Each structure stands twice: as C-alpha cells, then as structure tokens.
RNA sequence: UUACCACGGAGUGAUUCAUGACUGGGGUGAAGUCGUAACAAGGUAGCCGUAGGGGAACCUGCGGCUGGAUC
RNA sequence: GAAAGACCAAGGGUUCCUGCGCAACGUUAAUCGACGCAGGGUUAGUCGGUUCCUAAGGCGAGGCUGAAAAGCGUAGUCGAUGGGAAACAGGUUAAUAUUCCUGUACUUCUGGUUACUGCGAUGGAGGGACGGAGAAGGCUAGGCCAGCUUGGCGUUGGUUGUCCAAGUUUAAGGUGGUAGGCUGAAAUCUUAGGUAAAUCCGGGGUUUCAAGGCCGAGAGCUGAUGACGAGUCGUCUAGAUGACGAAGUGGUUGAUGCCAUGCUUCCAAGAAAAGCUUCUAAGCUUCAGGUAACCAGGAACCGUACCCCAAACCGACACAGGUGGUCGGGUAGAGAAUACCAAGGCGCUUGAGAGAACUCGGGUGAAGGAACUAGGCAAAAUGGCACCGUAACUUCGGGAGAAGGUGCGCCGGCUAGGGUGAAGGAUUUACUCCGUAAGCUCUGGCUGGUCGAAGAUACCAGGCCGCUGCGACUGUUUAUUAAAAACACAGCACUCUGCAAACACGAAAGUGGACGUAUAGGGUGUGACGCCUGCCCGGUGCCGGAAGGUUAAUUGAUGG
RNA sequence: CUUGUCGGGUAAGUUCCGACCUGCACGAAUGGCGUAACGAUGGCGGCGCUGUCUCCACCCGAGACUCAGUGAAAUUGAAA
RNA sequence: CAUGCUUGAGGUUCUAACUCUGGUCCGUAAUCCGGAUCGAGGACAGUGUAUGGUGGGCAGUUUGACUGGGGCGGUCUCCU
C-alpha cells in the first residue's frame, strides 16, 4: 500500500527550506518564532 | 466531401468525416509558426474561470495575416493548408517579392489566383479593399471594426456578411447572426465567403472524439447536491423545482445579458 | 478380422396439419338508437389520388375528370 | 531462475572490509550478525553533476494597481523530467575501479613559430527540430550444429568409437562509402522582400548538362607476431607464486536491438532556445582579427564504499504490503504464458515428538443427481489446432468460437516444394550480377505398420442454450461494507453573446474565454437509432409596449 | 385491495411468460413506445456436471495435544 | 403681441474635457508602461457620493407549552 510520505530532497527544500521561508513575511515570522523558542533545527 | 464510415465497430457507426483531398499534406511553412501552450481554463490566479476545457492534441499557432496591408503588390496562392486552431482553411500566399503569408482562404481559391488588395483592386473573390469602394449588395467576410486593427467579424467556416446600405462616413451590413450593424467606411473587408462550408455536416461519433479537441465532460446540475448547484437535491429524479438557472444564480431561459451602453449607437437593430 | 449395410441413437433446422387465453375486420338477421352522406343544381356538383381532422355517414387543403344542372 | 539472478535512478548514510567480543539488540541458543569496541576503505579531460541553452512555472529594476502588508507584470534571469565535446579491452585489493596499472584511442583549449589573408553582433538567414499506426526488407548481438585441441576408457550387460567431457574468446578506434533514404545541377543578369546593410536567404529572366550533392547500419581489412586461454613445469606454504601454455575454424538460425529523426498512410495536424554554418552594421586597416602547418603544455571543482523491487527506501517491527527504468540463456511452446533446468542465488532466526475431537488447505468416493438453498453459493464440468457444419433476429457490420461433430502418439515406404550456398557464365573488372553439387534449414502430400484403457496424455487451456426488465454501446463512481438501473457519452433542443462579447477569478490593475469571432463561445435540459412528441399563457418566471395611475433622494409655495 | 382473473410452463408455481382493463396513484425531451449489438446488471426456465444434498466415509499436509526455550492480551470491589 | 433678462425639458450639431484591450515615432535591445502625433467616440461612456428596485448569490437567527412516550387532534384568559 502507498503511504502519505514519499521522500524527495529537492521537493523538501523548495517548500520548507530556509530560502523559502525568507521569501515572504509569513515565513519570516515562522523563523523569528522558532528563534524565540530556542529551536536547534530552525529549518527543514 | 462528407464520408460516412461502415459500422464495423460500435464507435464507428455514427462517424461522418469531412475529408478534403486538395489540402496540402506536407509540412506547414516553418517561419510562420510559433508555439502555444494549453491552459485548462485557468487564469493567472490558477483558478478555473472557463470550465469543460482540458487535454487534446499538441498544436502550433499559425500567424495568419488579418490586416492584409500589402496594397498593390500581386500575390499567388501557393497552397491551401489545414489549421488546427481554426474551423476554416488557410492559404499560403506568395507575393511578387518573396514574402509568404497566411490568410483565411476564400471559397473558390485553389492553386493560382492573384488576390490583390487595396484601392483599385478588381471585384474578384479573395481581393481586399476598403468597404466604401465595394458595390452594395455584395457578400463580404473578414470585416474589421477599427482602421488598422485587422479582421474581427465573419472568420469562421462558411461565414459571410452582406453589404446592404451606405450613407455618410459609415456603412451598414447584415451579419450572419441576423443583426444590423453600421461599420466605418474606412475599414476593410474581403470579397466572398469563407471556405469549408461543409464543416457543419460532420458527426463526431464517439465520446473520445470530443476529448481529442480538449473538451471535458459536462455534468448536469440536476445530478448534483444542493451545495453544488441551485438545481441539486431531491429524492429520485427531480426537474430543478425552480426556474432554470446558472451555477452562479443567473437565469438562462431567455434573460438578456447585454449591458454595454457605449456601443449601443452602432446597432441598427438587434438580432431578435 | 476388414468392407458394405437394416433396426436403433444424438444434435440442429425446414415444411405441413390440428388446437390456443385474447383480439381484428366481414356477412347475415327483427317495426331498435343518432344523424341525413348520395340520387333533382339532393339544396356546399359529384367522383379519382393523397394528407390532416372528426360519434358516424363525412369535412377541409392540393392536383385531376365530366361519368355536372340554368345560361 | 521475465527471479527469490544481475544493474541504473530516487531514498538512506558507514549498514562496506578486517581484528577483538556476546551484557543489551536478533521473537529460541549463538562461538554467528545489517549488534558493541578499534582500525581501514571510495583515485576520472571522456561516467554522473557543475559550467552552456531553454519548457511548464517562479522571481522580477523601472512600471501599473491597491487602507497598510501587498497583487500583477516589462526588460531581465532562474528553473530538467529535454537539447548541447570526446574511451575501450585486459590485469589487480580483504574492501575501488570505463577512475589505479598495461595496451590502444578520442575531444577540447592555451602559448609560441612560419606562411597566407578583410576582421567584426545583441542583428538577418539556414540548421538544430521531433505525431499515431502500419509494412517490406538489410544487419547485428545471441543460440544451435559440425570440425579442431586437450583429457578419459568407467564399482553392473556393452563402450577404441557415427563414444564421452571441457574449451573453441577478443573491444573502442582507424580504413572502407555498401543494403538503402533524400535531392536536379551550373553559369550569368537582376531585385516593391528578410525593420538598417548584405557577396547570405527569398523572388524573377536567359543559356548549358543529365549529371552531381548530402545522409547511411553493416561486411571485409586493421587494431591483434598482442591479450585471454584447459593445463604443464619450478619455488614456497592442505594454497599461493614466477615462467610456459594446445585449438582458437566453418555452416545455419536469428531478434521487441540498429539502418529508422527512414518509408507509406491517417487526422486529433504533432516543444523551445543555444551550441553549429553563413551574411553584413557600428569599428579597424597593416598593430586587431582570421585560415592552415609545426612545437610545447593543460583540461579545474563536486560524487564514486554499501543496500537498492529490499532485513539498509515508504509502512512504529529484521512487517506475506508499496516502489520508476535496463538485461534477460536451454528443452518443449505462438509466446516475456507454463513445466523442468543454466549462470547466479537461496532452504524464508524456535525446534523435537505423537498421529484424539475440532478448524484450515487439498485427494478419492457406492446408488442417486439440485431432492440443498433466499439463490446451483461453492465445487464439479468445458477448454488446443485443422476440417466439416451452424438458428431466430439484424442497424447488413453482426449474432458466431452460435449449437454440434471428425482427426491427433511412435516407426517405416514413396514423393512435392522454399531459403542459404562451391564450381561455372557475363563485363559494370570487384563491398557486382546470374547461378550452383554437397551440407544445413523450413513447409507439405498419400500409404502402411505398431503399443497402451486412455496419444491436444503432464503444466497450460471458453460451459452452453431459451424467454424477459433496465441502460444504446467503450468508459466513470462512494481510497476503507453500495460498481449499479447511478455519472459521462455521441446525437437533439431551448436560450444568451457583435468582441473591450456573454461569462468567471480578482477591493483594483489584470487574467481566462481566445492570439478564438455566431458553422464561434457560455448556460440549461434530454441522452445511439426507429416512429413520434397531443391540449392549457389562468399562477410564477422571461420577453415586448408605453398611454394612464401610484412612486426616492431633491426642491421649498403656503400655513402655524 | 392482491397470491386480481384467464392461458402456458411443474406431480404441485405468492416468482416467470402471454393477455384482460376495474390506471388506489402511466403518459409523451424530470421524454412515450420499440429496438440489433453490448453488460463481473435484475427475474425465470433447460442440457451437461457434480459431496450442494440423502449421509457422510477414508486418506494427505498446517494447527490443536506433549516435551525444551522465549513469553502477551482484553478484564478484575473482594470471594470459602 | 415684439423683444430684452433668466431658468425646467427635449432634439440636433461641434471640439476642447474625458475614453480607446486602434496606427506610427521616441525612451529602448521591450506586444508592459509613459510622452508625442494621426484616427475614432464624445460631453455620452465611466468613477465618487446620495437615492428607489431587484437580489437564498451570501450571513445571523427564530420556528411555545401541556400531553398516561413524542407526533396529529384539542387546550391556554374570565363566569355558573
Ligand atoms: Mg519557427
Ligand atoms: Mg460547456
Ligand atoms: Mg482549439
Ligand atoms: Mg453536453
Ligand atoms: Mg451532461
Ligand atoms: Mg447542464
Ligand atoms: Mg443522481
Ligand atoms: Mg446524488
Ligand atoms: Mg465548489
Ligand atoms: Mg442554494
Ligand atoms: Mg435526485
Ligand atoms: Mg419521485
Ligand atoms: Mg423537485
Ligand atoms: Mg357532399
Ligand atoms: Mg361519398
Ligand atoms: Mg344530402
Ligand atoms: Mg351535395
Ligand atoms: Mg345544407
Ligand atoms: Mg387505392
Ligand atoms: Mg379529397
Ligand atoms: Mg375541418
Ligand atoms: Mg378539389
Ligand atoms: Mg381541383
Ligand atoms: Mg544518494
Ligand atoms: Mg532510514
Ligand atoms: Mg559485514
Ligand atoms: Mg570474530
Ligand atoms: Mg550465555
Ligand atoms: Mg537471544
Ligand atoms: Mg560493526
Ligand atoms: Mg519566464
Ligand atoms: Mg511577480
Ligand atoms: Mg518595484
Ligand atoms: Mg539560464
Ligand atoms: Mg537531465
Ligand atoms: Mg564491490
Ligand atoms: Mg590508463
Ligand atoms: Mg564576421
Ligand atoms: Mg535565428
Ligand atoms: Mg523531442
Ligand atoms: Mg512514429
Ligand atoms: Mg552464429
Ligand atoms: Mg583423444
Ligand atoms: Mg559401466
Ligand atoms: Mg562392465
Ligand atoms: Mg576481428
Ligand atoms: Mg570500427
Ligand atoms: Mg546505395
Ligand atoms: Mg567506485
Ligand atoms: Mg559501486
Ligand atoms: Mg540493486
Ligand atoms: Mg532481486
Ligand atoms: Mg522494516
Ligand atoms: Mg525473520
Ligand atoms: Mg515486506
Ligand atoms: Mg526462458
Ligand atoms: Mg502452449
Ligand atoms: Mg514464469
Ligand atoms: Mg547453479
Ligand atoms: Mg513435531
Ligand atoms: Mg493430521
Ligand atoms: Mg477439510
Ligand atoms: Mg474432487
Ligand atoms: Mg484409489
Ligand atoms: Mg457419488
Ligand atoms: Mg475405483
Ligand atoms: Mg457413480
Ligand atoms: Mg445426469
Ligand atoms: Mg428446491
Ligand atoms: Mg427444502
Ligand atoms: Mg460459481
Ligand atoms: Mg475449478
Ligand atoms: Mg443469440
Ligand atoms: Mg466449437
Ligand atoms: Mg448464441
Ligand atoms: Mg488396443
Ligand atoms: Mg414487453
Ligand atoms: Mg419485470
Ligand atoms: Mg451502461
Ligand atoms: Mg476499453
Ligand atoms: Mg479516477
Ligand atoms: Mg476507483
Ligand atoms: Mg467502498
Ligand atoms: Mg462494473
Ligand atoms: Mg465493492
Ligand atoms: Mg455515479
Ligand atoms: Mg448554443
Ligand atoms: Mg437523464
Ligand atoms: Mg430514458
Ligand atoms: Mg399572458
Ligand atoms: Mg404567463
Ligand atoms: Mg415592458
Ligand atoms: Mg402486490
Ligand atoms: Mg398475479
Ligand atoms: Mg396462473
Ligand atoms: Mg424456484
Ligand atoms: Mg410537451
Ligand atoms: Mg413522470
Ligand atoms: Mg418500454
Ligand atoms: Mg463496461
Ligand atoms: Mg439481460
Ligand atoms: Mg425448478
Ligand atoms: Mg511450552
Ligand atoms: Mg481581456
Ligand atoms: Mg502607446
Ligand atoms: Mg480626435
Ligand atoms: Mg456621462
Ligand atoms: Mg452616469
Ligand atoms: Mg455610482
Ligand atoms: Mg451616479
Ligand atoms: Mg439557503
Ligand atoms: Mg440561511
Ligand atoms: Mg430573505
Ligand atoms: Mg446562504
Ligand atoms: Mg450568536
Ligand atoms: Mg438556532
Ligand atoms: Mg421567537
Ligand atoms: Mg413538549
Ligand atoms: Mg400522547
Ligand atoms: Mg402508557
Ligand atoms: Mg399540536
């Protein structure tokens, strides 16, 4: 049976990557929200 | 001509093809071609704005000359071709100095002809000149609405308009729709009728022939739920218990929708 | 033991008789009901072919004939 | 064994190899391990990226629009799943190899020397450059057979021979211009065109000839007196190591691979851009630049271990699930089905007993033969190739493999053809034409004999027929209890829309409709085809009319 | 109402097929009536075939059972 | 009556505001966008504001209680 997660590293970086967040203000709010919490990862 | 097919299969019983042996069967003229990509009925927001569109064959765009502004120079009809994105045929003209062009083929042009354009041209079919020096009562096609804009009206297969009256700086002609309209006399037109008048006798025959042209199936509103259509709902078959209406709430059995008010003075009388 | 072959058997058709719930017209019969279509110019001249309509004879349209009266 | 064998891509990330270990992990034990500790292991001008070019799409200076955030978009520049330079065989490690080594290649750039020269783009032309189906060929890989070389003479009748086993291999590149495909060629004089120019492309006139020109598998030769090769000799520790090393040829068959982006044909009419060739503009012109020959040198950076239809990826698991592409041998067989095997891989990480009921998956069954049951559910049965023969009805295609029947193994006798192909013949005198005995291979015909219970003998492999309802048919649908009579459909009808179209998404700019133009586009109902589709405009809607009644903001006479 | 009545098919037919018309409460593009071919579509009837059944019997593998190893689950106020 | 001065309404016509998803020139290497100029329409169209009509396209809600179960029916205040 096919499952929901079919990995692809190129489609991963283009949707959730660092340069994708920085392109819009709503993604820039996500990054500043994750910096205030102290997240070690900070991006996909 | 029209060719009927033998009922060898269930999908061949009602196919009526329109096949023309005089059409060119080589490759189109390459310099006058450019790519065009499909849309599926989607605008720049990505939303479906016109529905029942999608699929079909891959097509090139033929740059058809709708202005015909090489006045004085004679031309020759090199061949008559097939256009995937018209219902009429097109003709490749070759002027007296190279300069090959595509135009909408008139009914009678096959392989020779001269098809000159401009002031002083004869009254043969396929010639083009301003609508003012065109004898009244004649049949024309490819009428332009603004000077220098190109043909707009009577371009489909078998289409024509009749020149009925002329007075002042305008001229009056009767459209194929039944509508009386006045056009500027400075505008241009072509003499005759558009080719491929037998196109209306075809029969597709099967559901897959419609999909070849990029048309998707149509679902009736009475086959939906109340949340999708105003016609939806009911136990068993129902008949759209309200007055027949569009999916967006507009009445469709006879209610007029023209509200221009800027071009009203150009209508001598409506088609009704 | 082989060949020929009658009876008999299986499958699928054709043709012809009898019969069949129920239905369609036809003919005949009795002081029955409704109308008056034709025969006189029969009171809208009648007939022929065809199409539509009507309880019914019939009516109407189109084309044809005199086997139509007064003049 | 069309995988449970190999190999790419995605994904994973040290799981790879070696030494030491067994607490935990492994559905049992473990000395073993995809487990713990420690070392080691991935070598490129040619492979894949990057670099060059663009598709859908994204972003987008200025710009237009918008309470703000922001939206759309021009120049532009990103974006492969596509286009664009060039390598193959043989050795070698515990672990890498088209990368290291050996041998033989190819591509591209830089710097010097000489000789001869009109150079120059962002721009113009050519080219790149392409659909579905089908059919004749030509060829190759691969497979068989024969010969040759080496070895053998069989625990039991025979086996020195029309015996048995193994091997009989070899690339890129160069040369060759063939089967075959496309196409007329040359000179001269000009020019309403290709935004400017043009010696380039396109158009026109005249003369001469029937010959050129461009593509193109493959054969042969060469690479190759080399590598490889059963095995032999020697040395060392039951194996490695150095040297040596036989034959290595012919005939048939033959692809879904190549010619082939070819040819024929049909409608639904079948990517772009750059690299590449050519032309000139702005500018140089004896400096720059270009074209040949020779010499010297370079080709950077990144990835290369391992799994990869799975115990390493997606499923919480060492989970009967899912996962794109390539190769794919022998005997039967139409076949990539099926059966038994090859190369290669594995026996699926709890076992041992015994032989109760009952459950699961199967085999056979007396006499009946649907009596079972809501219902022939399930099971049983039919099943191939050739030939004979086949009803109502029909839209004349069909129904139809209707129904039903006959033959089929093996060994001889006689006999008919096709393909390939020595020698010969022609002269077009060599990658050529005709044609060949033997050999090999393929397709038949009519005549006997013979064994068994049974010869389409196993695997494989349609049950059929007669009345009716519904839907014309192929198709689609409730991922996970409903596949249908439901949806779609070709056909039919009504209605709207004259183009800055109706309509739809958008506070708007704008976009789709459509680079379409009433034989078109949108909405609605019905649903092939045949015969048809009757009466009602009182209600509600829509269309038309405009006389007369009412009737908004607005105005502000009059009175208080 | 209703398993309406009549005919056929069965030894026997609330289903099936052909009619009648008394249409509770058919009907003409929410189309009417037919229709060859088609359907993992609904109903009925036959031939063949049979463990579907009378009515089960025997046989073969995997569990169940015993021995060794590892080792769950729902549930549970307390139980003589 | 004849005019003068306004001012309600209608028609015609003009260009000069406005509009052009028409042509050609420039910014410019550019189907956007501006500026210039021809052509067309033209005080209309269109937008702001005020106002009448339409408007399940969309929204926030309402739709009683008793009751020998609820629903249907009946009842709900006052007098004997
Ligand atoms: Mg082109
Ligand atoms: Mg549509
Ligand atoms: Mg189209
Ligand atoms: Mg439709
Ligand atoms: Mg539909
Ligand atoms: Mg509809
Ligand atoms: Mg439905
Ligand atoms: Mg529904
Ligand atoms: Mg929706
Ligand atoms: Mg609604
Ligand atoms: Mg319904
Ligand atoms: Mg109903
Ligand atoms: Mg209803
Ligand atoms: Mg009469
Ligand atoms: Mg009579
Ligand atoms: Mg009478
Ligand atoms: Mg009379
Ligand atoms: Mg009378
Ligand atoms: Mg007669
Ligand atoms: Mg008559
Ligand atoms: Mg009448
Ligand atoms: Mg008459
Ligand atoms: Mg008459
Ligand atoms: Mg990887
Ligand atoms: Mg992982
Ligand atoms: Mg290991
Ligand atoms: Mg060890
Ligand atoms: Mg232990
Ligand atoms: Mg253990
Ligand atoms: Mg380890
Ligand atoms: Mg772009
Ligand atoms: Mg943008
Ligand atoms: Mg900006
Ligand atoms: Mg780029
Ligand atoms: Mg790629
Ligand atoms: Mg390895
Ligand atoms: Mg080397
Ligand atoms: Mg140059
Ligand atoms: Mg170019
Ligand atoms: Mg391509
Ligand atoms: Mg093809
Ligand atoms: Mg061979
Ligand atoms: Mg020997
Ligand atoms: Mg022996
Ligand atoms: Mg012996
Ligand atoms: Mg060789
Ligand atoms: Mg070669
Ligand atoms: Mg040739
Ligand atoms: Mg490697
Ligand atoms: Mg590797
Ligand atoms: Mg693998
Ligand atoms: Mg495998
Ligand atoms: Mg797992
Ligand atoms: Mg396991
Ligand atoms: Mg698994
Ligand atoms: Mg095989
Ligand atoms: Mg077979
Ligand atoms: Mg198999
Ligand atoms: Mg093996
Ligand atoms: Mg046991
Ligand atoms: Mg047992
Ligand atoms: Mg059993
Ligand atoms: Mg059995
Ligand atoms: Mg037995
Ligand atoms: Mg029995
Ligand atoms: Mg027996
Ligand atoms: Mg028996
Ligand atoms: Mg029997
Ligand atoms: Mg029974
Ligand atoms: Mg019973
Ligand atoms: Mg069954
Ligand atoms: Mg079976
Ligand atoms: Mg039949
Ligand atoms: Mg048969
Ligand atoms: Mg049949
Ligand atoms: Mg016998
Ligand atoms: Mg019937
Ligand atoms: Mg029925
Ligand atoms: Mg169907
Ligand atoms: Mg199909
Ligand atoms: Mg689907
Ligand atoms: Mg599905
Ligand atoms: Mg379901
Ligand atoms: Mg189905
Ligand atoms: Mg299902
Ligand atoms: Mg459905
Ligand atoms: Mg329409
Ligand atoms: Mg319907
Ligand atoms: Mg129907
Ligand atoms: Mg009325
Ligand atoms: Mg009305
Ligand atoms: Mg009105
Ligand atoms: Mg009943
Ligand atoms: Mg009954
Ligand atoms: Mg009965
Ligand atoms: Mg029964
Ligand atoms: Mg009607
Ligand atoms: Mg109805
Ligand atoms: Mg019917
Ligand atoms: Mg189907
Ligand atoms: Mg049926
Ligand atoms: Mg029975
Ligand atoms: Mg135990
Ligand atoms: Mg637009
Ligand atoms: Mg402009
Ligand atoms: Mg003007
Ligand atoms: Mg206005
Ligand atoms: Mg206004
Ligand atoms: Mg307003
Ligand atoms: Mg206003
Ligand atoms: Mg509502
Ligand atoms: Mg509401
Ligand atoms: Mg309301
Ligand atoms: Mg609503
Ligand atoms: Mg509230
Ligand atoms: Mg509420
Ligand atoms: Mg209330
Ligand atoms: Mg209550
Ligand atoms: Mg009660
Ligand atoms: Mg009670
Ligand atoms: Mg009540």
mmCIF file of N, CA and C (backbone and C1' of nucleotides) in Angstrom, chain B residues 30 60, chain D residues 83-84 127-130 261 271-274:
data_model
loop_
_atom_site.group_PDB
_atom_site.id
_atom_site.type_symbol
_atom_site.label_atom_id
_atom_site.label_comp_id
_atom_site.label_asym_id
_atom_site.label_seq_id
_atom_site.Cartn_x
_atom_site.Cartn_y
_atom_site.Cartn_z
ATOM 1 N N UNK B 30 7.388 26.745 -42.005
ATOM 2 C CA UNK B 30 8.005 26.860 -40.686
ATOM 3 C C UNK B 30 8.180 28.291 -40.184
ATOM 4 N N UNK B 60 0.593 23.919 -32.930
ATOM 5 C CA UNK B 60 1.328 25.142 -33.209
ATOM 6 C C UNK B 60 0.352 26.238 -33.608
ATOM 7 P P G D 83 17.579 14.822 -24.992
ATOM 8 O "O5'" G D 83 18.110 16.140 -25.710
ATOM 9 C "C5'" G D 83 17.623 16.532 -26.985
ATOM 10 C "C4'" G D 83 18.166 17.879 -27.397
ATOM 11 C "C3'" G D 83 19.678 17.986 -27.516
ATOM 12 O "O3'" G D 83 20.174 17.485 -28.745
ATOM 13 C "C1'" G D 83 18.861 19.823 -26.284
ATOM 14 P P G D 84 21.575 16.705 -28.800
ATOM 15 O "O5'" G D 84 22.655 17.795 -28.376
ATOM 16 C "C5'" G D 84 23.048 18.826 -29.270
ATOM 17 C "C4'" G D 84 23.998 19.796 -28.615
ATOM 18 C "C3'" G D 84 25.325 19.223 -28.146
ATOM 19 O "O3'" G D 84 26.275 19.108 -29.188
ATOM 20 C "C1'" G D 84 24.392 20.549 -26.431
ATOM 21 P P G D 127 16.658 24.505 -43.003
ATOM 22 O "O5'" G D 127 17.621 23.858 -41.914
ATOM 23 C "C5'" G D 127 18.753 23.086 -42.287
ATOM 24 C "C4'" G D 127 19.686 22.912 -41.116
ATOM 25 C "C3'" G D 127 19.080 22.234 -39.894
ATOM 26 O "O3'" G D 127 19.185 20.822 -39.975
ATOM 27 C "C1'" G D 127 20.198 24.225 -39.243
ATOM 28 P P G D 128 18.179 19.867 -39.168
ATOM 29 O "O5'" G D 128 18.510 20.149 -37.634
ATOM 30 C "C5'" G D 128 19.716 19.694 -37.036
ATOM 31 C "C4'" G D 128 19.824 20.195 -35.620
ATOM 32 C "C3'" G D 128 18.664 19.813 -34.714
ATOM 33 O "O3'" G D 128 18.856 18.543 -34.117
ATOM 34 C "C1'" G D 128 19.071 22.139 -34.545
ATOM 35 P P A D 129 17.861 17.328 -34.441
ATOM 36 O "O5'" A D 129 16.425 17.906 -34.076
ATOM 37 C "C5'" A D 129 15.261 17.100 -34.196
ATOM 38 C "C4'" A D 129 14.143 17.835 -34.892
ATOM 39 C "C3'" A D 129 14.474 18.386 -36.276
ATOM 40 O "O3'" A D 129 13.297 18.335 -37.082
ATOM 41 C "C1'" A D 129 13.809 20.151 -34.876
ATOM 42 P P C D 130 12.730 16.929 -37.613
ATOM 43 O "O5'" C D 130 11.818 16.396 -36.418
ATOM 44 C "C5'" C D 130 11.360 15.047 -36.393
ATOM 45 C "C4'" C D 130 10.973 14.607 -35.003
ATOM 46 C "C3'" C D 130 9.473 14.629 -34.698
ATOM 47 O "O3'" C D 130 9.127 13.526 -33.858
ATOM 48 C "C1'" C D 130 10.618 15.995 -33.150
ATOM 49 P P U D 261 15.145 6.968 -35.095
ATOM 50 O "O5'" U D 261 14.668 8.221 -35.955
ATOM 51 C "C5'" U D 261 13.288 8.432 -36.247
ATOM 52 C "C4'" U D 261 13.033 9.816 -36.797
ATOM 53 C "C3'" U D 261 13.632 10.095 -38.175
ATOM 54 O "O3'" U D 261 12.795 11.015 -38.873
ATOM 55 C "C1'" U D 261 14.540 11.604 -36.608
ATOM 56 P P A D 271 6.384 19.313 -33.216
ATOM 57 O "O5'" A D 271 6.841 20.434 -32.186
ATOM 58 C "C5'" A D 271 7.401 20.080 -30.933
ATOM 59 C "C4'" A D 271 7.405 21.245 -29.979
ATOM 60 C "C3'" A D 271 8.504 22.274 -30.179
ATOM 61 O "O3'" A D 271 8.190 23.211 -31.194
ATOM 62 C "C1'" A D 271 8.346 21.708 -27.888
ATOM 63 P P A D 272 9.247 24.343 -31.615
ATOM 64 O "O5'" A D 272 9.079 25.469 -30.498
ATOM 65 C "C5'" A D 272 9.872 26.644 -30.520
ATOM 66 C "C4'" A D 272 10.428 26.968 -29.156
ATOM 67 C "C3'" A D 272 11.870 27.450 -29.135
ATOM 68 O "O3'" A D 272 11.974 28.837 -29.392
ATOM 69 C "C1'" A D 272 11.559 25.776 -27.486
ATOM 70 P P A D 273 12.895 29.374 -30.588
ATOM 71 O "O5'" A D 273 14.317 29.595 -29.906
ATOM 72 C "C5'" A D 273 14.474 30.498 -28.823
ATOM 73 C "C4'" A D 273 15.580 30.066 -27.895
ATOM 74 C "C3'" A D 273 16.937 29.831 -28.537
ATOM 75 O "O3'" A D 273 17.666 31.025 -28.755
ATOM 76 C "C1'" A D 273 16.422 28.018 -27.129
ATOM 77 P P A D 274 18.682 31.137 -29.991
ATOM 78 O "O5'" A D 274 20.016 30.444 -29.466
ATOM 79 C "C5'" A D 274 20.711 30.955 -28.340
ATOM 80 C "C4'" A D 274 21.566 29.899 -27.685
ATOM 81 C "C3'" A D 274 22.689 29.325 -28.531
ATOM 82 O "O3'" A D 274 23.835 30.155 -28.573
ATOM 83 C "C1'" A D 274 21.508 27.561 -27.514
#
